[PDB]
Amino acid sequence: MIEKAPTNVEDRDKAPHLLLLAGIQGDEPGGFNATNLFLMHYSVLKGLVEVVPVLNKPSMLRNHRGLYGDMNRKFAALDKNDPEYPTIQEIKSLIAKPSIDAVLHLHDGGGYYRPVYVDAMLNPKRWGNCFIIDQDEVKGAKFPNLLAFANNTIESINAHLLHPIEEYHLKNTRTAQGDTEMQKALTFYAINQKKSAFANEASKELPLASRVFYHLQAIEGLLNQLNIPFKRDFDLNPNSVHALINDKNLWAKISSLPKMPLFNLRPKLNHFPLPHNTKIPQIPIESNAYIVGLVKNKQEVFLKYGNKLMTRLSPFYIEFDPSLEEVKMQIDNKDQMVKIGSVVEVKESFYIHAMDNIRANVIGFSVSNENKPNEAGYTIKFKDFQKRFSLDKQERIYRIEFYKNNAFSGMILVKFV
Numbered sequence: 001m002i003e004k005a006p007t008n009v010e011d012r013d014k015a016p017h018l019l020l021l022a023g024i025q026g027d028e029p030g031g032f033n034a035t036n037l038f039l040m041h042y043s044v045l046k047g048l049v050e051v052v053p054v055l056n057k058p059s060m061l062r063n064h065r066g067l068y069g070d071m072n073r074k075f076a077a078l079d080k081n082d083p084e085y086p087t088i089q090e091i092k093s094l095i096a097k098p099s100i101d102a103v104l105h106l107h108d109g110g111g112y113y114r115p116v117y118v119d120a121m122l123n124p125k126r127w128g129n130c131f132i133i134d135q136d137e138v139k140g141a142k143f144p145n146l147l148a149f150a151n152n153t154i155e156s157i158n159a160h161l162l163h164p165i166e167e168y169h170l171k172n173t174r175t176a177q178g179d180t181e182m183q184k185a186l187t188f189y190a191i192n193q194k195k196s197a198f199a200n201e202a203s204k205e206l207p208l209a210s211r212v213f214y215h216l217q218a219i220e221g222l223l224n225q226l227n228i229p230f231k232r233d234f235d236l237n238p239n240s241v242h243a244l245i246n247d248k249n250l251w252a253k254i255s256s257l258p259k260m261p262l263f264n265l266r267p268k269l270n271h272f273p274l275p276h277n278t279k280i281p282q283i284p285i286e287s288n289a290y291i292v293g294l295v296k297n298k299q300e301v302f303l304k305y306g307n308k309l310m311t312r313l314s315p316f317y318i319e320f321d322p323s324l325e326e327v328k329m330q331i332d333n334k335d336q337m338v339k340i341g342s343v344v345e346v347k348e349s350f351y352i353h354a355m356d357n358i359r360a361n362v363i364g365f366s367v368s369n370e371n372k373p374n375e376a377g378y379t380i381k382f383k384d385f386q387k388r389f390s391l392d393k394q395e396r397i398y399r400i401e402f403y404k405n406n407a408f409s410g411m412i413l414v415k416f417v
């Protein structure tokens with residue numbers, strides 16, 4: 001859970017609290033890209049929005065609806081030995097917190113829901129582009145009138161339709177009256193804790209940016225109904241959404257390695273250092289996004305951003321010796337200390353000063369066929385690189401790797417600008 005909170009802690013209790021959740025199915029990227037963009041680009045000014053951006057991360061990482069079965073059928077009877085049992089308790093505990101008032105659960109769904117059969121794509125069996133309640137009223141909730149809240153949220157979404165076919169409709173599953181499937185799902189659990197609970201569906205027929213657009217419309221519609229004041233730092237249209245999903249400023253930091261751009265990496269990165277004796281899911285990974293991770297696939301390690309494959313790492317596993325903190329380098333004739341794990345911009349040249357006990361391999365530069373070379377003490381320019389060794393498709397970013405005996409002492413990236 002990630003908090004989107006006012007800067008003044010005192011403002012937390014001055015408006016309602018919403019719990020915003022997506023990615024209970026790992027192949028529904030509208031939902032988890034929307035929670036991602038919300039965390040990255042919105043501000044909550046009073047009250048609080050608690051976000052679990054992706055409920056089923058292992059499944060997201062494999063582009064899979066649910067590796068351990070349908071997580072959204074696990075909110076009623078559940079075997080204590082179910083692999084998702086701990087996850088389910090975390091979620092139910094967030095839902096049932098006295099400080100939470102409302103719950104919004106995002107999904108992507110096939111076709112377009114219509115309450116009357118129109119055709120195979122538009123009918124009551126379909127799920128796309130609807131706003132869903134389990135029943136019209138939840139007595140004892142802070143906001144008991146789910147129906148009114150839903151109708152007003154649908155109004156807000158329908159003020160912004162990209163095409164008429166995308167019109168939102170109310171879907172009331174009347175769950176307690178015999179819907180045994182929905183009785184096992186998240187929002188029904190929430191209403192049983194006297195929370196006002198809603199699900200939004202964006203149609204799988206839509207491109208990702210349009211799915212995310214509609215989820216964000218639903219989030220804003222509901223925040224307005226709750227009177228949780230918010231801002232965002234962008235204009236809400238599909239182009240703007242696309243730009244932010246595919247943002248060149250997105251990065252990932254694996255272990256103590258430098259920040260790497262998410263987009264426009266080469267599809268495969270060879271001889272990539274990873275800490276030994278460390279299970280893949282336990283390798284630290286930081287990002288300015290909230291849906292990034294690593295997953296093992298055969299012998300490779302995939303860098304994932306939602307369902308997008310950003311690169312395939314071909315690792316070599318090695319001790320990460322943390323002793324080397326900085327390296328003396330010259331950049332465009334300007335001498336300076338460079339922290340291990342830095343990215344440095346270069347216009348013309350660089351040079352690494354020799355070090356006792358430390359060997360430098362500039363990846364893409366060579367002066368011999370030594371398999372374990374020392375390339376400190378060379379003045380290096382762009383023309384000196386074999387461009388295929390670049391980290392990026394643009395052939396501008398190069399790895400410098402440092403070794404102390406048989407241990408890995410760190411990496412610095414140079415970016416030619």
Ligand SMILES: C[C@H](N)C(=O)N[C@H](CCC(=O)N[C@@H](CCC[C@@H](N)C(=O)O)C(=O)O)C(=O)O
Binds near residue numbers: 072105107108126187
């Ligand atoms: C074809 C394949 N079985 C498939 O992906 N079906 C989906 C089925 C649609 C689907 O999952 N809705 C959700 C609705 C849940 C709403 C609400 N109670 C909640 O807890 O948020 C579900 O039932 O968990 C499709 O048609 O979009």
Ligand SMILES: [Ca+2]
Binds near residue numbers: 040041233
């Ligand atoms: Ca932003």
Ligand SMILES: [Ca+2]
Binds near residue numbers: 025028107108
């Ligand atoms: Ca779903």
Ligand SMILES: [Ca+2]
Binds near residue numbers: 363364
């Ligand atoms: Ca080299």
